[PDB]
Structure 1
Amino acid sequence: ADGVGNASGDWHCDSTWMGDRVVTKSTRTWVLPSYNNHQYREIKSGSVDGSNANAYFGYSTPWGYFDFNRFHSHWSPRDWQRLINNYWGFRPRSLRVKIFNIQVKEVTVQDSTTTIANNLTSTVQVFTDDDYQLPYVVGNGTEGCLPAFPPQVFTLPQYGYATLNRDNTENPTERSSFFCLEYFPSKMLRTGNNFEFTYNFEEVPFHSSFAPSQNLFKLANPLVDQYLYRFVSTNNTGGVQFNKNLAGRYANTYKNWFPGPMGRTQGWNLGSGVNRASVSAFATTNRMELEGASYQVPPQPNGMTNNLQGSNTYALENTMIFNSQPANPGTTATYLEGNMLITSESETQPVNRVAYNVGGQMATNNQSSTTAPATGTYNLQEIVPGSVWMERDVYLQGPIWAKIPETGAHFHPSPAMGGFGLKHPPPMMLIKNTPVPGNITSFSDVPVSSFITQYSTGQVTVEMEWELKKENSKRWNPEIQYTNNYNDPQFVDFAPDSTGEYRTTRPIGTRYLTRPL
C-alpha cells in the first residue's frame, strides 16, 4: 500500500477545456540539493557597483521552494494560442499541488570514486505557509519555476530573504527579524509517502485580453457637431470669441474621460534606429528614493505604452525583457537585441500614453494686457478623477500573480510586472532534506557539524482551474490572431533543437481580439 515498491502518484499533464472553465495539469521532476550543509547563514552586502541600494542584510536557509508562478509552467504554446485568440479574459479559480515518488540519494567520495546510493530510511520535510508569516519571495520575478517544457528536470531554488539593514550598509537594525523555518509544523516524508495541498483563489477581476478598437479621445460621433462651444480667440479689444465644435474635429471636442498616469522614460531605437554612441545609461534612468538610497524601477507603473505601433523606438525601462534561453547564475555577459525577447505594449496605445514623450501642457502664468499667455509641458502626471488605462499585458513567459504588501494602505493593487495582485496568494511550499549525522563516537555539547551528504528527487503535479470570459462581438471583418508564421524556418519554434535544447524565439501576449471602448 505505502512502501518502497509502490508508486505514490501518477503523471498528470493535460488540459481540459469545458465551457467557461479550463483545468491545466502539469507534472515535473525536481531535484533538491542540501543547501548550506544544513546551516542557517547570515548573508549581507555593502554598496556594490557604485550603488548603496545594493546593500542588504538577510539570511539564507537550508530549505528550498516550489515556484508555480510563470504561465508556461501551466500552459502549452498551443493551449495559450487557443486561449488568447478565442477569449476576452481569464482568472484563476483554484489550485492543488501534490508531491510524490520521493527518492533520497546518499553520495560518498573515496579517492574520487564518488558513488551514489539511495537511502530508503531517509526523510524529506515539507510545509506550506498558510498564514503568510514568512517573507514571501515568490512573486518577484526570479528564477526557479517549473520548466516550460515537461521533459526538463529542474533544481529547487534556495530560500532566503533580506530584512532591514542600517544606514544603507550591511549591518542590521533592531527591527531586523530572524525567521526559523523549523519552527513551523511540517510533514516528514519517506519514499512511500506523498504530500497534497489545495487552495482557492480569492475573487479578482479578469485579466482583460483584448485591444481597444477606438481611440479614447475619438469616442464622439464624426457625423454630428457638438452643442458645446470653445474659446477660440480675442479681438482687437480684449473681448473673447467662441466657435462651435464641429463634427469630426477631435482636437477641439470636449472629453469625458482622460488617459492614465504617466512618467517619462527615455526612448531607444531598436533595429535600424541610430541611437547614440557609448552611453553608460545608469545615471539617466528613472529612479525612486527610499531610506536615502536611489533605486531603478525597471518596469514603470501601469498606464503607459512602451512602443508606439510600428516604430523602432522603445522605452526599455517600461519594457519586460526576456532571454530566448536560460542562463547560468551570475552571468555578466552583454547581450544584443537578437538574444532578447522584447515585449511591446503598443496594442494599448489608443488608451495609454507613450512613455518617451511629454504628456501634455498647462498654463504657466496669468495673462494681462501686458503679458501674453504661456504654457509648458509636463513630464509626469498621476491619477486623476475620470482616468482610464489598461494594465500590463501577461505573457506566456511572465508571472501569474503577486502578493500585495501588508501595510496600512494601497491603491489599485495591480502588479507592475503583470498578473493578479493577491492579498492571500498561493502559499509558499518549502522543502528540505532532513539531516543524517555522520559517525559520532563521543558526547559533545556543541552541535553536530558532520553529516551524510545527500540529495532528493521526485515529482510534483500542479492543477489549476481557470475561469474564462467568452468573446461576444459584432465585428464583421476578421480579426488578428496569433499565428505560427515564419519565412524559411531552419527549425520549428517552441520545440527541441537537434541537441535537445528547447527553443522559444518570440514572446506571446494575450491581446489580439479587439473590442470597442
Structure 2
Amino acid sequence: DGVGNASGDWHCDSTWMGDRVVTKSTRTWVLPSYNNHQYREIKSGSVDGSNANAYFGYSTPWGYFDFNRFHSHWSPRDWQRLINNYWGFRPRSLRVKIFNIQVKEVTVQDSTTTIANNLTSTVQVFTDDDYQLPYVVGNGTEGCLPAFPPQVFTLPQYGYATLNRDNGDNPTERSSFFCLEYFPSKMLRTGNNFEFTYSFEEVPFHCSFAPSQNLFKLANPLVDQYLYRFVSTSATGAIQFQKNLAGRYANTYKNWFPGPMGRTQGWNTSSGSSTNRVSVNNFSVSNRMNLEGASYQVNPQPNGMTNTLQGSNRYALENTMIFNAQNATPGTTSVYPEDNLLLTSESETQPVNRVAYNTGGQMATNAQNATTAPTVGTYNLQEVLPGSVWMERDVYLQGPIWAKIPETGAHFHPSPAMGGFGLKHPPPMMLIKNTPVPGNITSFSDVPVSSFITQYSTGQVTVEMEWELKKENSKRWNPEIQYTNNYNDPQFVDFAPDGSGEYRTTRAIGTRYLTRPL
C-alpha cells in the first residue's frame, strides 16, 4: 500500500469465552539471506562413530516460521488458568499474518559496515498447503516464536535430508530434490502484507487430568468377587481353589491392563547420585532401534510408561523430555549437569502407566510335571494387548503442540512420542526468503550471476489460535492440587526478566493437576 503506512497492528492477547479461548501473539522477526541465495547439497558421513548420523540433503536459501511450541501462544499465567481449571483442550483454528516488512541493504567498505533501507526490495512468501515438501516442523527443533513477546528472533533456515546410500553421504536413485522456487509465492515490498488461515481436523482432546484411582484396584474393597482362583495343588496333585476376597487387589480378576512398556535404565538424580554407576557412557548401553542397517536412539520411547515413581529420585532418563532452562547457542557441546536443565516427570500417570525402569511382569516359561516344578520368567518389554489402557505423554508449556503423522498407509495410534496432537494435515510450512538483488553486472554471460547485494529483512508476525476447552465436572469434595507460584525466599521472579533483561524460567509446567476417578 505505502511506504509511510503501517500494514498491521500489534496483537498479543488471550480472550476466554466459555469453552473457547483465543490466543494472539505478535513477534518481531529478522530473516538473514541464507546461503547467499543458493541451494546446497549438504551431506555427512559417520559422526561420533555412528553411521546413523550419515545423511544426504539440501540446505535452501529459505527460512520458515515455526509456531509449534505452547509458550509461543500461552503466557505462563494463562497456562496456569488452563491447567488448574480444565480437563482438556485441543486446537481448532489458526490465522497467521506477516506485516510491516523492512528490507535492509548492508554495505561494508574499508572497516565500515553501513545499513540503509531498500524501499524497492521484496520478500517472497508461500505456504505448503498440499504437503508436497518435507515437513520439518514437528521434530522438536529450535527457531519457534519466542516465549517472551518483546524478544526479537531469527527465522531458522529450511533444509531437509532425503535418502542416502548404505548409511553413507551418497544419494540413491530415489533421492529427491525439491526446488522451493517451483511453488507460486507472494512477493512483498515494504507496504504489502501476507495473511493465511487454517482449521484443524477433528482431533481428540488432550487429557489434562491425573487418575485418582489405580487401574488394578477398581473393585469395591468391601465386597468379594464371585470368582475363585487356583492357589495350589494338594499332596496328591489335586488342583485347589479359593474365593477372591474383598480388598485383596493382588488376587482379584482384572478386566483391564496397563499399556505397553519397554524397559529403560533408571538413574538417580543428585540426592541419590552416590548410588549411580560411575563413569558410564550411555550410548553403548541405551535403548536403540535398527533401521536400514543402522542403530538410532529412540528417546523418549513410545507412549504407555511413566518415567518416574512419585516419591523417588530415580528417573528413566531416556523416557524423559529434557529442556534447557535457557536458550542455548547453536552447536554447543558442553556437558550440562542437572542444575541447568528442566527434567519432566510423568508420575501423575503411574496409577495407570507402568514404570519404565522396572520389569513389566512375569509369565510361565515351561510345562509343569510331577518331576518339573512350575517356572516363571520376567519380561522387559511388552507391546499392545487387547483391553489395555494407558495415558499419553503430558504436554508442557515449553514443549511441542503437534506432529505430522508420517504418510505410509499404515499406522497404529498416531500420537507422537514427544506429546501433542498427531495430525494428518498440520498447519502448513510457511516459507520466506529475501528476493535476490544482483550487484553491478556490466557484461553478458550465460553463467548465472553470483554477485548479489547483501540484504536482510525484518517484520512482524502475528499468530491467532482458537482452542476448544473441556470443562472439569467433578464431585470430588476435598480440595485439588493446583499449580501455584510457590518459591521459598525468591531472589528473582520466575517467568520474568532479570536484571540483565534475560527472561528466566525455572520450571517445566505440565498439564496434569486435576483428578478424575477411573
TM-score in terms of structure 1 length:
0.99
SS of 1:84 mapped into structure 2: helix
Aligned to 1:365: 366
Q: Offset at 1:123?
A: 0.2
Contact 1:273 1:312 in 2 (8 A): no
Contact 1:307 1:346 in 2 (8 A): yes
Q: Offset at 1:272?
A: 4.9
Q: Offset at 1:23?
A: 0.1
Matched residues in 1 for 2:314 and 2:214: separation?
21
Matched residues in 2 for 1:383 and 1:187: separation?
48
Aligned to 2:159: 160
Show CA shifts across 1:457-495 (max 9, x none): 000000000000000000000000000001101001000
Q: How does 1:279-298 map to 2 (within 5 A)?
A: 279-298=280-299
Contact 1:12 1:461 in 2 (8 A): yes
Matched residues in 1 for 2:282 and 2:164: separation?
28
Contact 1:288 1:294 in 2 (8 A): yes
Contact 1:69 1:399 in 2 (8 A): yes
Q: Offset at 1:273?
A: 5.2
Give the fraction of aligned pairs with identical amino acids, expressed as a percent. 92
Q: Offset at 1:510?
A: 0.3
Q: How does 1:75-90 map to 2 (within 5 A)?
A: 75-90=74-89
Show CA shifts across 1:201-220 (max 9, x none): 00000000000000000000
SS of 2:92 mapped into structure 1: strand
Q: Offset at 1:408?
A: 1.6
Aligned to 2:44: 45
Deviates more, 1:416-425 or 1:271-280: 271-280
Q: Offset at 1:274?
A: 2.3
Contact 1:94 1:464 in 2 (8 A): yes
Matched residues in 2 for 1:98 and 1:112: separation?
38
Aligned to 1:302: 303
The total of aligned residue pairs comes to: 515
Matched residues in 2 for 1:480 and 1:275: separation?
32
Q: Offset at 1:298?
A: 1.4
Mapped pair 1:437 → 2:438: yes
Matched residues in 2 for 1:413 and 1:290: separation?
20
Q: Offset at 1:112?
A: 1.4
Instruction: Pick closer, same or farther for the CA change 1:348–1:273 going to 2, 3 Å.
Output: farther
Q: Offset at 1:276?
A: 1.3
Matched residues in 1 for 2:229 and 2:435: separation?
76
Q: Offset at 1:310?
A: 1.6
SS of 2:369 mapped into structure 1: coil
Show CA shifts across 1:78-102 (max 9, x none): 0000000000000000000000000
Matched residues in 2 for 1:361 and 1:147: separation?
48
Matched residues in 2 for 1:368 and 1:283: separation?
42
Matched residues in 2 for 1:310 and 1:415: separation?
28
Contact 1:57 1:162 in 2 (8 A): yes
Q: Offset at 1:367?
A: 0.6
Matched residues in 1 for 2:59 and 2:372: separation?
65
Matched residues in 2 for 1:121 and 1:153: separation?
24
Contact 1:259 1:387 in 2 (8 A): yes
Gaps of 5+ in 2: none
Matched residues in 1 for 2:373 and 2:83: separation?
53
Show CA shifts across 1:154-180 (max 9, x none): 000000000000000000000000000
SS of 1:85 mapped into structure 2: helix
Aligned to 1:130: 129
Show CA shifts across 1:275-331 (max 9, x none): 111111110000000000000011110000000002000011000000000111000
SS of 1:138 mapped into structure 2: coil
SS of 1:120 mapped into structure 2: coil
Show CA shifts across 1:23-51 (max 9, x none): 00000000000000000000000001010
Contact 1:273 1:313 in 2 (8 A): no
Contact 1:35 1:62 in 2 (8 A): yes
Q: Offset at 1:65?
A: 0.1
Matched residues in 1 for 2:176 and 2:284: separation?
33
SS of 1:164 mapped into structure 2: coil
Aligned to 1:447: 448
Gaps of 5+ in 1: none
Show CA shifts across 1:229-274 (max 9, x none): 00010111010100000000000000000000000000000x5552
Matched residues in 2 for 1:120 and 1:55: separation?
43
SS of 1:282 mapped into structure 2: helix
TM-score in terms of structure 2 length:
0.99
SS of 1:36 mapped into structure 2: helix
